[PDB]
Design a protein around this nucleic acid. Sequence first.
RNA 1: AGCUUAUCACCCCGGAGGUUUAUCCGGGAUGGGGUCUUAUGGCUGGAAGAGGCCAGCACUGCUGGCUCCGGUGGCUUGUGACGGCCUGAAAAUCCACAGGAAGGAAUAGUUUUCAUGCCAGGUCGUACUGCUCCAAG
RNA 2: GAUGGGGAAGCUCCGUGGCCUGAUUUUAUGCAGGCCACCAUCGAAAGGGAAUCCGGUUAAGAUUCCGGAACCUGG
RNA 3: AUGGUGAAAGCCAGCUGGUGG
Lengths: 411, 184, 43, 408
Amino acid sequence: MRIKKKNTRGNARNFITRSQAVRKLQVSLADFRRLCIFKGIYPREPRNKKKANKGSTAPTTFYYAKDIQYLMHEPVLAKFREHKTFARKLTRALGRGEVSSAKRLEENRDSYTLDHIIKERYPSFPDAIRDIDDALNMLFLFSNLPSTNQVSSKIINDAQKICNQWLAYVAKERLVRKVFVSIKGVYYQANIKGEEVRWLVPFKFPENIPSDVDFRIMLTFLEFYSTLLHFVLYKLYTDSGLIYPPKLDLKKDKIISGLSSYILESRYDSPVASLFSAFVFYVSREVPIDILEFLILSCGGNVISEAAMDSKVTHQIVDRPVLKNKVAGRTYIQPQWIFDCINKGELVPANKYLPGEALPPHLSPWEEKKLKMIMMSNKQKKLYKKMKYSNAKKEEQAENLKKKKKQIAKQ
Amino acid sequence: VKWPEYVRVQRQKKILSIRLKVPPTIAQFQYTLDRNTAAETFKLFNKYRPETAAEKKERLTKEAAAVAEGASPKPYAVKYGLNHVVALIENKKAKLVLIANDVDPIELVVFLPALCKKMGVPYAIVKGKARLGTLVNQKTSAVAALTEVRAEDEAALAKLVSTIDANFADKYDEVKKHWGGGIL
Amino acid sequence: LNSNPEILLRKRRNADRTRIERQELAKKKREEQIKKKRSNKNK
Amino acid sequence: ENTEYSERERNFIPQKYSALRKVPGYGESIRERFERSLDLYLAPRVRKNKLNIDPNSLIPELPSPKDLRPFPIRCSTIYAGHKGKVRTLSIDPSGLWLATGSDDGTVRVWEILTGREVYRTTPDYHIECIEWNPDANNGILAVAVGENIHLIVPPIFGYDIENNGKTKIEDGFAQWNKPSQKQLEKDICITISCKKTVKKLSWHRKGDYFVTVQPDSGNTSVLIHQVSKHLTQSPFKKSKGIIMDAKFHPFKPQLFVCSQRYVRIYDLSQQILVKKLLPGARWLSKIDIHPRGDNLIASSFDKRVLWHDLDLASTPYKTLRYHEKAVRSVNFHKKLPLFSSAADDGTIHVFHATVYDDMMKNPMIVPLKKLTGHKVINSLGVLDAIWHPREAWLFSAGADNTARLWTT
RNA sequence: AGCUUAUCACCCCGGAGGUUUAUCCGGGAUGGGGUCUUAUGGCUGGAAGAGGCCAGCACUGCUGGCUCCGGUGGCUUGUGACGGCCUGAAAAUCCACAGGAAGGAAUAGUUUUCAUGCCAGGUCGUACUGCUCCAAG
RNA sequence: GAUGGGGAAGCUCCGUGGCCUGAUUUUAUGCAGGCCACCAUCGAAAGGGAAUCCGGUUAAGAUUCCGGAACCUGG
RNA sequence: AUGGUGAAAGCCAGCUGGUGG
């Protein structure tokens, strides 16, 4: 054959530049990014930066040619184009003064659905359960986010309803096996089909919203996460035989509209699920019911809230410096004891966590030689030096695990 | 540098129109009604937008459904068809006449203002046929008029006609003066 | 070596610039937004 | 707080909270989740293998160095008193007359046990190299300085034994020049004149041939002369650079010419390039030849030392980089397999070698122990060293106008 | 393919003749000291196992040797370096130079104009005859 | 020689965009900015052009087949 | 007629003697 060019094959065709891919797709960067997020496409590091390009040392992001080529045939592009055409037509109608025509046009529109995207991105339910970690982590945070100009209140309400559905299913299924509390929030873990899915529930305080973060990307991710969560919830309810979607409890919604509402029905096999069995609890006002109520409900206990009006209870939770009544029939407990019980999975004695006492720390449940190294090769010598430098940090951590722990105790 | 051929042609057309001397019959447009009175006229007309295809279909379907299970007054709307408007004018039936200043065939509407003046029917010229079309659910109409205004708005229409008289017919009664377009 | 294969995420280059400069631009836009309201009182 | 973003193991400061209800809401939750979402699609995903091999397994299973004893361990005698730094050292074939030479022109000889001096004799004139005649019972010592080379026979031996070398010098009766009156009065035998300043010198195993190197002489950078005949020859006349050193093969009629980047083995009889070496280092400083010729060893200015296997390939079989400064002297022991290495950092090392040649196998080398004591002065450390003929004793010189002798 | 091999061209001292067949060079020469572009010269491997020159016997091949060492005295070719007369093509393709944005560290910091190793390299013309090719004394 | 065009009723004649950057582009998921200058194609088996040499093979083939040994483009 | 086809400069020695062609 004729003289082939210096670099026009191999990495030069397997990867396509971001700008080149966008130009070939004839799609705006916003729409391309949305499609990428929906498909989960990501940039890849070429084996040789200067070989993928034509000797260019300038920075670049290399995508997979096959992935982009396959993405070009997805219906989502057609739906996006239809949405753009509908938007232009609605703008024309609004500018023409025919509000009724605009209302009729808008009322007859239908949005796209990502159901087929899920069946190809996560062909099997275990994969969806594995990847639901990020979806839960985002939805739980968005549930407590107050409504703003960047996100309509309907989206926040839908996210909160999805989170409530998930929490109710978990409590009824009692699949929770490990819990933890952190500054960033309260971590919850459930053995959903043995996948030990973990999610972080942030504190219910008013979530500060820094305007720097671009909500457009966040909303795009949240849409896919909400669809995935809805499908997973439907699948789980069908597998368990419970009705779906469960009906909200209007009577309970008036009081606190907490986890108690949204009752579910059909149509104790583990130490975690058997703890607190048949127990009745009373939560003081100052303790977060939203956090403790879920744990007790999953454990199979009963909780009486102070707001029940806004005894027979064998356990009481209060964080006040001084308890007022101290009825002998109620066992006063700090939430740290409840957390420790779930972490260990056994009924640790309650006498160690009386109110007002010290709070114990809470931990998560999860030349002889130099002589022979003179002749080592450059690669081996560098590897050994880097390994020693890395192990220096491990040794420092091991030393510090006891140094301060012993020094502070003496004072 | 270079520019699109059509862009250059249209740009040169504006210069030619500005510099070329036009007869008194031409340039009678662009001496349009003031912004305020034109806005008031459009506001009044918006209350009488003719029924659109969707609304008419909905009304007919509702009537059919009512009949299936088992005396409205005369409809009121603005008349905008050029042939229909011209047939209404010269019959002393139209009360207000609106004429667009940007009709592509100028000769198509040169006689309409003069015909209205001869017939004595009040008339006015407004900028843009697109504005007239927007209020009648059409791309363009080039003309607009009212024939049967509701009693509630009869006084408003009379006052608008009286104001338009002074605003346009009296201010531009000398539009027949020295040929326009005499700009260096 | 007995190494365990795994997926790795390379650090996003120029993230610090994309954060700081964008924050500064947003601050400037917010500051300039009130200017239009202040100056629209002379209509 | 002063560190830049994303270069931080933890994005929050842990704090002690007395109660759960007193825990404040997190002030960075939204930012962290937004960054995670961004990385989920903008972070370049790569497939990598995480190394889990312990560093201990990388240690080679070399023979224990102590089993290779004896070898030098610590100093036992020190020579000093020179006004200038001792640039070179020389030892007689019997390992008794340790000669010393310094850039100030002072020449001294010291005992190997008590260290007492036995004889003494004398910016652009310095002594560059001194080497005892490999042949025994001659007492001929060569001295290189400036553009001339001097042959000196000190009175350490006597008159008849020294008359033996005087007869060789007279047998001859760049060109040779008669000694000056001062040279004659200072027990200097004869002098030679070279085209340019000489910087290196080496004797032949037979005690008759020797070579000299004249830097800045592009064509005459290297010359060969004979004591008996006062000959003047050259193995090669041209090269792609200046020549740095030259040495004779212990038992073959070829001279090892060491250039800056290359070393060339030129046959003095066949006048052909037997082999050309391609050292892994960039520039070479000195070269020595194993007495059996099985291994070629050289030193490089860029802290490198070369172990050139003449049977395996042109490039060195193995290279060492532990030296902290330019390697200045590397020589093979006359009897033992040990070879020493010294550099300007004042560090000396000795390595045992499996010189076994009964089979087509590469020689195994192991380090023995580190040595120090030559404090670096003006960035210069160990200048030259020589091995004892029969025992693991090493003589070293440094820029501090001091020489040290190491013994087991 | 590795050594080896440089007319020309260029570098350091110098301070008032060198040189071609054919007049060319200098107040920076005569001279001394060096570098480089490898045109084709010698070595080896390829490579004597190839081919050729002989002897012997088989009765369808084999066995033994030689294939070496030179010289300069006319035709020829390729190239190099000089010197006479008015500017003698275009494109494809490789390399370098000014450049400093970009990227480079702790269980592999970045790269592989370095070395070795691996794979693939399509279609047509292709026999014969034949304006153009080689020419001993 | 088409091509941007122009005569001829007429077969017909004259005329000689692909690259890079961005957190996804603040009234809220409709795209922003920067680089350079022109006109395809055909037209050389004596021009430029990357690469193979020795021995043998026939009824016609080889620098293609074989025996031996290298060279050039690309990943 | 209609519609097509084909092609001696120079320089060396003492105007005299010389070299290059």
